[PDB]
């Protein structure tokens, strides 16, 4: 498409995985590597997505996705995933998550850093970084059609004033896109 954000999708490294319920597992924990997790939370029927990135290789080791999970279950699953990957630190989009989730991240002792996606400017920095890394052949994700489709359908639009917006085509989702961008915000 003319308005595609990820014009370098052809450079994406596609990784086999095992589907273990809500997790797509590419690689189990490598203790000699350091990891982080990009985390998008779901309000109401929206998807939550947690993307585990190996910072030593630049590859997604695990991606967990679900909808309809309770707020506490979203935090608990994130905790488990962090623990599974050596207390991997979480890059959490805390914007619009609400008091309960913010309090629970602290109360549960989660290793996390807030990165609130609170404006088009922030979103554009995150996405541009992902897109730049992707075109350089540095992004490697589970070879899953749902993931690739969401990237494929992430597009450019304009606001009434002529400002750039990035969003899903049609009435689609971008929780996977955003989780990935949050993770890759940490990758050098
Ligand atoms: Co979302």
Numbering used by the authors: 255 to 442
Give the authors' words.
The large terminase protein is a key component of the DNA packaging machinery in tailed bacteriophages and evolutionarily related herpes viruses. Typically, in addition to an ATPase domain which powers DNA translocation, the large terminase contains a nuclease domain which cuts concatemeric DNA, generated by rolling circle replication. Crystal structures of the large terminase nuclease from the thermophilic bacteriophage G20c show that it is most similar to the RuvC family of the RNase H-like endonucleases. The overall structure adopts the RNase-H fold.
Structures for complexes with Mn2+, Mg2+, Co2+ and Ca2+ were determined by soaking crystals of the apo protein, whereas the structure of the Zn2+ complex was obtained by co-crystallization. Only one metal ion, bound to the site A, was identified for conditions containing Mg2+, Mn2+ and Co2+. This metal ion is coordinated by the side chains of D294 and D429 and four water molecules in the canonical octahedral geometry. The nuclease was active in the presence of Mn2+, Mg2+ and Co2+ but inactive with Ni2+, Zn2+ or Ca2+, consistent with observations for T4 gp17 (41), SPP1 G2P and HCMV UL89 (18). However, G20c nuclease had minimal activity with Co2+, in contrast to the high non-specific in vitro nuclease activity observed for SPP1 G2P nuclease (comparable with Mn2+ (39)) or the absence of activity for the T4 gp17 nuclease.
